[PDB]
Design an enzyme around this catalytic site. Sequence first.
Site, PDB file in Angstrom:
ATOM      1  N   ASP A 173     -13.678  -6.183 -14.464  1.00 32.92           N
ATOM      2  CA  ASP A 173     -13.048  -5.255 -13.517  1.00 32.92           C
ATOM      3  C   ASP A 173     -12.368  -4.093 -14.245  1.00 32.92           C
ATOM      4  O   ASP A 173     -11.235  -3.721 -13.935  1.00 32.92           O
ATOM      5  CB  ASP A 173     -12.039  -5.990 -12.629  1.00 32.92           C
ATOM      6  CG  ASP A 173     -12.683  -7.072 -11.774  1.00 32.92           C
ATOM      7  OD1 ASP A 173     -13.929  -7.110 -11.689  1.00 32.92           O
ATOM      8  OD2 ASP A 173     -11.939  -7.891 -11.180  1.00 32.92           O
ATOM      9  N   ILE A 194       3.359   5.095 -14.567  1.00 33.02           N
ATOM     10  CA  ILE A 194       2.599   6.261 -15.015  1.00 33.02           C
ATOM     11  C   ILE A 194       2.771   7.328 -13.932  1.00 33.02           C
ATOM     12  O   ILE A 194       2.144   7.259 -12.869  1.00 33.02           O
ATOM     13  CB  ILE A 194       1.127   5.906 -15.247  1.00 33.02           C
ATOM     14  CG1 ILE A 194       1.008   4.646 -16.110  1.00 33.02           C
ATOM     15  CG2 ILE A 194       0.398   7.113 -15.869  1.00 33.02           C
ATOM     16  CD1 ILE A 194       1.691   4.735 -17.468  1.00 33.02           C
ATOM     17  N   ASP A 237       4.723  -0.470 -16.963  1.00 33.92           N
ATOM     18  CA  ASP A 237       5.109   0.916 -17.164  1.00 33.92           C
ATOM     19  C   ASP A 237       4.670   1.751 -15.963  1.00 33.92           C
ATOM     20  O   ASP A 237       3.564   1.582 -15.429  1.00 33.92           O
ATOM     21  CB  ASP A 237       4.481   1.466 -18.445  1.00 33.92           C
ATOM     22  CG  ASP A 237       5.179   0.957 -19.710  1.00 33.92           C
ATOM     23  OD1 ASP A 237       6.202   0.236 -19.592  1.00 33.92           O
ATOM     24  OD2 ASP A 237       4.709   1.278 -20.804  1.00 33.92           O
ATOM     25  N   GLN A 294     -10.989  -0.738 -15.179  1.00 35.96           N
ATOM     26  CA  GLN A 294     -10.614   0.490 -14.477  1.00 35.96           C
ATOM     27  C   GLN A 294      -9.402   1.060 -15.205  1.00 35.96           C
ATOM     28  O   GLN A 294      -8.822   0.409 -16.078  1.00 35.96           O
ATOM     29  CB  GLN A 294     -10.338   0.236 -12.988  1.00 35.96           C
ATOM     30  CG  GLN A 294      -9.302  -0.829 -12.697  1.00 35.96           C
ATOM     31  CD  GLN A 294      -9.192  -1.124 -11.209  1.00 35.96           C
ATOM     32  OE1 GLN A 294     -10.181  -1.481 -10.562  1.00 35.96           O
ATOM     33  NE2 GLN A 294      -7.997  -0.967 -10.660  1.00 35.96           N
ATOM     34  N   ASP A 324      -6.172   7.392 -10.221  1.00 40.55           N
ATOM     35  CA  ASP A 324      -7.002   6.198 -10.312  1.00 40.55           C
ATOM     36  C   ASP A 324      -8.432   6.564 -10.678  1.00 40.55           C
ATOM     37  O   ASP A 324      -9.044   7.434 -10.038  1.00 40.55           O
ATOM     38  CB  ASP A 324      -6.990   5.435  -8.987  1.00 40.55           C
ATOM     39  CG  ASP A 324      -5.888   4.402  -8.928  1.00 40.55           C
ATOM     40  OD1 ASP A 324      -4.706   4.790  -9.016  1.00 40.55           O
ATOM     41  OD2 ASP A 324      -6.208   3.199  -8.789  1.00 40.55           O
ATOM     42  N   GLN A 355      -5.366  -5.147  -3.327  1.00 40.15           N
ATOM     43  CA  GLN A 355      -4.591  -6.375  -3.416  1.00 40.15           C
ATOM     44  C   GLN A 355      -3.092  -6.150  -3.608  1.00 40.15           C
ATOM     45  O   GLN A 355      -2.292  -7.017  -3.238  1.00 40.15           O
ATOM     46  CB  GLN A 355      -5.099  -7.247  -4.581  1.00 40.15           C
ATOM     47  CG  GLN A 355      -6.562  -7.636  -4.479  1.00 40.15           C
ATOM     48  CD  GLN A 355      -7.011  -8.561  -5.609  1.00 40.15           C
ATOM     49  OE1 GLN A 355      -6.947  -8.210  -6.792  1.00 40.15           O
ATOM     50  NE2 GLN A 355      -7.454  -9.754  -5.243  1.00 40.15           N
ATOM     51  N   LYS A 356      -2.683  -5.014  -4.186  1.00 40.76           N
ATOM     52  CA  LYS A 356      -1.295  -4.870  -4.611  1.00 40.76           C
ATOM     53  C   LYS A 356      -0.611  -3.671  -3.973  1.00 40.76           C
ATOM     54  O   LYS A 356      -1.241  -2.626  -3.739  1.00 40.76           O
ATOM     55  CB  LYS A 356      -1.195  -4.742  -6.140  1.00 40.76           C
ATOM     56  CG  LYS A 356      -1.719  -5.941  -6.926  1.00 40.76           C
ATOM     57  CD  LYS A 356      -0.954  -6.143  -8.238  1.00 40.76           C
ATOM     58  CE  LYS A 356      -1.293  -5.104  -9.288  1.00 40.76           C
ATOM     59  NZ  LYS A 356      -2.665  -5.262  -9.856  1.00 40.76           N
TER      60      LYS A 356
HETATM   61  N1  LIG Z   1       1.631   1.378 -13.488  1.00 39.96           N
HETATM   62  C1  LIG Z   1       1.457   2.223 -12.473  1.00 39.96           C
HETATM   63  N2  LIG Z   1       2.070   3.423 -12.527  1.00 39.96           N
HETATM   64  C2  LIG Z   1       1.885   4.297 -11.537  1.00 39.96           C
HETATM   65  N3  LIG Z   1       1.181   4.145 -10.413  1.00 39.96           N
HETATM   66  C3  LIG Z   1       0.605   2.926 -10.371  1.00 39.96           C
HETATM   67  C4  LIG Z   1       0.684   1.941 -11.341  1.00 39.96           C
HETATM   68  N4  LIG Z   1      -0.049   0.822 -10.959  1.00 39.96           N
HETATM   69  C5  LIG Z   1      -0.555   1.163  -9.798  1.00 39.96           C
HETATM   70  N5  LIG Z   1      -0.205   2.424  -9.385  1.00 39.96           N
HETATM   71  C6  LIG Z   1      -0.577   3.083  -8.141  1.00 39.96           C
HETATM   72  O1  LIG Z   1      -0.648   2.101  -7.126  1.00 39.96           O
HETATM   73  C7  LIG Z   1      -1.996   2.003  -6.623  1.00 39.96           C
HETATM   74  C8  LIG Z   1      -2.301   0.545  -6.446  1.00 39.96           C
HETATM   75  O2  LIG Z   1      -2.336  -0.094  -7.741  1.00 39.96           O
HETATM   76  P1  LIG Z   1      -3.560  -0.966  -8.234  1.00 39.96           P
HETATM   77  O3  LIG Z   1      -3.031  -1.705  -9.428  1.00 39.96           O
HETATM   78  O4  LIG Z   1      -4.808  -0.101  -8.432  1.00 39.96           O
HETATM   79  O5  LIG Z   1      -3.854  -1.947  -7.028  1.00 39.96           O
HETATM   80  P2  LIG Z   1      -4.799  -3.184  -6.956  1.00 39.96           P
HETATM   81  O6  LIG Z   1      -4.837  -3.583  -5.450  1.00 39.96           O
HETATM   82  O7  LIG Z   1      -4.278  -4.296  -7.775  1.00 39.96           O
HETATM   83  N6  LIG Z   1      -6.376  -2.921  -7.488  1.00 39.96           N
HETATM   84  P3  LIG Z   1      -7.218  -1.677  -6.724  1.00 39.96           P
HETATM   85  O8  LIG Z   1      -7.883  -2.198  -5.397  1.00 39.96           O
HETATM   86  O9  LIG Z   1      -8.332  -1.299  -7.708  1.00 39.96           O
HETATM   87  O10 LIG Z   1      -6.332  -0.424  -6.408  1.00 39.96           O
HETATM   88  C9  LIG Z   1      -2.867   2.736  -7.630  1.00 39.96           C
HETATM   89  O11 LIG Z   1      -3.999   3.370  -7.038  1.00 39.96           O
HETATM   90  C10 LIG Z   1      -1.924   3.793  -8.190  1.00 39.96           C
HETATM   91  O12 LIG Z   1      -1.867   4.956  -7.368  1.00 39.96           O
END
Ligand SMILES: Nc1ncnc2c1ncn2[C@@H]1O[C@H](COP(=O)(O)OP(=O)(O)NP(=O)(O)O)[C@@H](O)[C@H]1O
EC number: 2.7.1.-
Length: 175
Positions: free
Chosen positions: A131, A85, A83, A133, A90, A17-18
């Site tokens: 959810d 990271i 923040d 994770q 993941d 999603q993001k």
């Molecule tokens: N706070 C963070 N710091 C560093 N890397 C991040 C962070 N949040 C996300 N990422 C990276 O960006 C990717 C996408 O973020 P994520 O929040 O997992 O997406 P999402 O679409 O909301 N949910 P998901 O489908 O489970 O990946 C992650 O797999 C990490 O590699």
Amino acid sequence: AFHDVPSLGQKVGAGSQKDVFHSRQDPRQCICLFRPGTTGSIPAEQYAQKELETTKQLKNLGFPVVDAHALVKHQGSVGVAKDFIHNALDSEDIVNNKKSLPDNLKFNKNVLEDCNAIIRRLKNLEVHIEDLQFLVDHNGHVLINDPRDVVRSSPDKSISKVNELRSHALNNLLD
Ligand SMILES: Nc1ncnc2c1ncn2[C@@H]1O[C@H](COP(=O)(O)OP(=O)(O)NP(=O)(O)O)[C@@H](O)[C@H]1O
């Protein structure tokens, strides 16, 4: 509530999603934006708010979290400032066997102890995190990421979630 971020930094990741970007205004932070169409009939604004609020609830309950600080928007896409990271792994990739934890002893020890502490708190409080994770930081610390809700209920499903990830560290420490 949603504060404009005129300029995005380098892209660091993308999920179901993001899209996630370095924050240009703060090197310790990243900009996590919902891509258009990914949240369906729920406004993405409501997902972002729930991510921020649930993160704060979990922080208040003592859980280790990827801290979230504000609601943000850029070019009509909305999300959360969090923040950053660095070199984060993941959890889903690890439990899916898509990636592997490093061999480092202290690293796996941090994964083990942090998973123990998360399970310990889940069991004692008896809460369920929708959810559930995590991100694993470069030292092996385990941080809850993208929590969608937290409620008082059977913790068994959430615990199983953590145990999934811990098993990889536990197996490494036995070998
Ligand atoms: N706070 C963070 N710091 C560093 N890397 C991040 C962070 N949040 C996300 N990422 C990276 O960006 C990717 C996408 O973020 P994520 O929040 O997992 O997406 P999402 O679409 O909301 N949910 P998901 O489908 O489970 O990946 C992650 O797999 C990490 O590699």
